[PDB]
Structure 1
């Protein structure tokens, strides 16, 4: 009978720690979803910017030749 009362004291402790973790875990997952969205977004722009400078330098090289 006494053990029936003691066993309950440990149950509530694990339930709260699990809920508290789930609360932050979901928040971190949501945050990650937002960050990863901008990550690939910036990566796409970075790749685009890299494509621009490559074409610019190529054209500039031609302009220099024609200038001379």
Structure 2
């Protein structure tokens, strides 16, 4: 119970971290979608310009 309760806290903290990594990797992927759309739109602007 204490091994699984402290590991429940580790696993809740690792859920908070796994979720934080879901949010951070999703948040960064979404930032990259914006960076990507920005450089894709700049590329389309430069490609249209070129």
Which of the five TM-score ranges fits, normalised by the shorter chain?
Answer: 0.5 to 0.7
User: Which structure would you say has the larger Rg?
Assistant: 1
Give the 3 Å change call, closer, same or farther, for CA 6–40 of structure 1 in structure 2. Answer: closer
Paired residues, number: 46
Structure 2 unaligned spans of 5+: none
Where structure 1 has 5 or more consecutive residues not aligned to the other structure, the ranges are 47-68
**Displacement of 1:9 after TM fit?**
4.6
TM-score after normalising by structure 2: 0.60
Quote the RMSD (CA, aligned, Å): 2.3
